[PDB]
Ligand SMILES: CN(C)CCc1nnc2cc(-c3ccccc3)c3cc(Cl)ccc3n12
């Protein structure tokens with residue numbers, strides 16, 4: 001009756017050097033550049049990355065004077081692409097700019113639906129699957145940049161499958177079932193050396209030992225040689241599940257990067273996460289989903305909906321009343337509460353927008369009820 | 370009403386900049402498959418003010434006129450004059466496509482995909498997303514037959530349904546709120562549009578039993594909507610619209626512009642196939658199926674099933690049934706669902722799921 005009560009679930013993450021994530025980071029690098037000069041800048045910056053080319057497309061209303069060449073190349077440099085042998089060089093890439101730039105009860109800028117989610121299974125109130133997947137990429141980047149593993153290159157993908165049990169609506173991670181790691185590398189290091197390092201210096205430095213056992217399946221560099229990576233074009237907003245909960249909770253479809261606070265796709269999703277995390281940390285539930293919806297002409301949310309998966313003694317109707325007395329989810333109010341005019345967005349564009357307590361929406365609000 | 374909840378899904382029309390890109394990408398995919406069934410295609414489209422950009426990689430024996438494909442797609446969508454904000458005759462098309470010239474084959478990538486099905490509609494789909502899609506389809510229908518000649522291709526719809534649930538089964542009670550925004554010419558007045566949207570669109574799509582006098586209508590809520598179409602549109606930026614409207618789950622992979630060798634598409638189609646087969650087979654009322662792959666590996670890394678409590682059989686038992694009836698290796702999925710056919714442009718608007726003309730929407734008869 002053991003394997004009848006357990007289930008597997010998988011989440012993935014990608015490194016800074018993955019073509020899609022390159023675009024997210026560049027898009028938010030542009031957003032930050034504008035906000036540093038003009039806190040009220042309106043930005044919708046889409047980035048396309050392909051073989052020796054970065055294209056910026058979208059609309060900007062800003063007083064800022066932004067050197068897009070410098071912004072893009074410094075972003076690519078920071079990511080780690082500085083030579084043709086790595087498949088991409090910030091010094092020589094073609095940068096094409098196609099941005100049309102112009103100089104509290106406000107209606108939503110669009111329509112749409114957004115979700116926030118939280119779970120007590122980790123201290124950061126995030127699913128273990130997506131937390132581990134992210135941290136594997138962060139470790140890779142760390143070991144690349146300090147020279148511990150100098151053969152590493154920026155592009156990578158990780159995938160973590162966790163064995164779960166459910167406990168009265170709450171989910172409880174038992175063990176890591178399967179781990180996948182594929183990462184770009186130079187032409188010198190051999191497969192064996194890489195696979196040993198990925199297990200001992202990456203996986204074992206990231207995953208708590210209690211989740212690993214002798215049955216855990218490792219797929220390390222499963223395709224083999226991975227010398228040329230980075231920019232099949234990458235596009236901004238093509239990793240939105242990686243950006244959020246790794247498949248847990250729910251998603252309304254809106255991408256985050258390249259968008260300023262007036263885009264409810266971003267601000268309302270941050271706020272919804274804020275609500276969800278505040279509820280769980282507040283001890284009101286162990287696990288919770290929050291949906292918000294807007295109309296392009298209306299300031300107040302069209303609907304606010306709450307699912308606590310049965311992990312609360314309070315009803316969802318009751319939780320909604322608590323949320324309404326503690327939160328104002330109008331776009332113009334979210335900005336003030338979460339201080340969203342700060343140039344803080346490039347840091348969100350890799351390793352997930354949620355689960356890191358340096359972000360305002362990751363600091364639980366003390367609830368009054 | 371402690372047991373009721375609201376849930377909202379949205380859809381967009383063919384003229385929405387993101388969906389324009391999805392359609393173009395799949396028009397390109399189809400063009401190759403029509404000449405070369407074994408074509409490898411990864412086509413990304415970018416659409417902005419007077420410009421369509423194609424970027425990606427193609428391995429094909431086909432000789433494809435990308436100019437004709439793109440412009441004919443834009444024409445079909447309905448953008449044929451500058452007064453509409455976009456004209457297939459004059460748009461700038463930039464092509465940056467690099468073109469190059471069994472059952473146990475490894476996955477082309479890694480990733481996770483979900484399939485979902487629910488017995489709340491005949492098409493085994495959530496009511497919210499079915500209605501949202503069908504509202505946009507009705508708009509295009511009435512635009513193209515000339516019933517509402519003031520209509521233009523760009524549109525967005527949003528449907529909020531009031532639900533009840535019984536141990537995981539979801540029971541739609543009524544439509545709570547409907548939002549419709551649609552592009553239009555400079556002549557027709559707002560009142561004429563709003564009354565038409567209610568009487569000729571909404572009442573023609575939504576079952577009367579779901580509508581009452583408390584239903585909230587937001588028709589042309591932003592007002593004047595003359596300029597629509599190409600904020601740039603991008604391929605793969607409407608993946609929740611493409612699937613279940615927020616229900617079930619999503620692994621993050623976009624569909625359009627990708628050939629069948631991309632598990633992001635083929636395995637998501639297969640998972641829907643599995644899920645719909647289970648519900649239509651009477652094994653559950655509602656079900657979520659996750660599958661995951663690793664690059665280079667043929668068999669799924671994991672297959673996982675959540676029936677939300679809507680089956681008397683356990684999920685382990687449902688898994689036993691799935692494994693005995695389905696082979697979820699990438700190379701076998703292609704053969705079972707006939708995925709080398711140029712059928713993909715048809716998927717790129719109004720949702721990939723819930724329409725029975727697609728192979729993954731024909732339930733497999735289960736043996737167990
Ligand atoms: C008794 N039985 C073993 C319990 C199994 C169980 N209990 N709670 C959940 C939640 C999800 C889930 C749903 C949506 C999104 C993410 C995860 C889930 C998903 C999958 Cl594929 C399989 C099982 C799942 N599950």
Ligand SMILES: CN(C)CCc1nnc2cc(-c3ccccc3)c3cc(Cl)ccc3n12
Pocket residue numbers: 249250289290291305306307316371372373374375376534615616617
């Ligand atoms: C007794 N109480 C009224 C029950 C409420 C309820 N019962 N089943 C579901 C499922 C979802 C759901 C989850 C994930 C995706 C889609 C829908 C959901 C979502 C929201 Cl925002 C609110 C409530 C939801 N729900």
